[PDB]
């Protein structure tokens, strides 16, 4: 019983940390994507000057 409880709580901690890692990766991915989407959108829209020029 003690071993099962200890393994259960060990897994609880390990998988909670794994979930934290996954959530961190997902949110950082979203942030990088958004910032460089801003950059790329500016870059692309900054050519209608050329085309009207």
């Amino acid at each position: 019983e003690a071993r099962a409880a200890m393994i259960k709580q060990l897994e609880d901690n390990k998988n909670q940390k794994i979930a934290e890692i996954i959530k961190e990766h997902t949110q950082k991915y979203n942030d990088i994507k958004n910032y460089y989407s801003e950059i790329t959108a500016t870059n692309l829209d900054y050519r209608k000057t050329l085309k009207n020029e």
Partner: protein, 52 residues
């Protein structure tokens, strides 16, 4: 403990690979415009001077 650390590190390696992929992808698609536009404006000035 061993097995959970194995999975944790596999997961972080996957995350790092995905992040690096996205990094090169968006840098590559970010790296184009300003200089071409500078050249366009340079030749704009050249042209209009030729007309004057």
């Amino acid at each position: 403990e061993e097995r959970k650390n194995l999975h944790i590190n596999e997961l972080m390696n996957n995350h790092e690979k995905a992040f690096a992929e996205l990094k090169k992808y968006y840098n590559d698609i970010t790296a184009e415009n300003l200089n071409l536009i500078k050249a366009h404006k340079e030749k704009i000035a050249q042209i209009y001077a030729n007309i004057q």
